[PDB]
Amino acid sequence: HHSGEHFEGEKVFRVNVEDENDISELHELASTRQIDFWKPDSVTQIKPHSTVDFRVKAEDILAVEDFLEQNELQYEVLINN
Numbered sequence: 001h002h003s004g005e006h007f008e009g010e011k012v013f014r015v016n017v018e019d020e021n022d023i024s025e026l027h028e029l030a031s032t033r034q035i036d037f038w039k040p041d042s043v044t045q046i047k048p049h050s051t052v053d054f055r056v057k058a059e060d061i062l063a064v065e066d067f068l069e070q071n072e073l074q075y076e077v078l079i080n081n
Contacts, residue, residue, distance in 0.1 A: 003065065009058025013065070016074040019048040025073050034060045 013035070017023050023046050029035065030043045037043070038053040046052070057064075068075040 003062040004059060007058075009056045009061050011056055011061075011065075011077050011079050013054040013068060014076040014078075015050075015052050015054070016076055017046055017048060017050045018074060022074055023047070025071060029064075029067060035064050 015026060017026070027043055027046070035054050035057065038055050041052045067073065
């Protein structure tokens with residue numbers, strides 16, 4: 001299917017890091033953060049089993065949602081069913 005074909009972002013990409021593995025991936029994005037964090041991040045200090053949130057941004061979502069799905073980088077959304 002497509003991603004951004006008359007749709008918005010309408011999602012709350014929350015994150016749930018388990019350990020350093022998960023961090024090590026999300027951490028990269030920071031360099032070119034298409035996203036911004038909400039409560040509480042400061043990426044440099046993210047550590048295991050932690051829970052932080054992002055926001056409903058759109059248009060460039062595809063890369064973010066992809067960066068979060070292809071690997072299932074423990075992201076949580078409360079707008080599914």
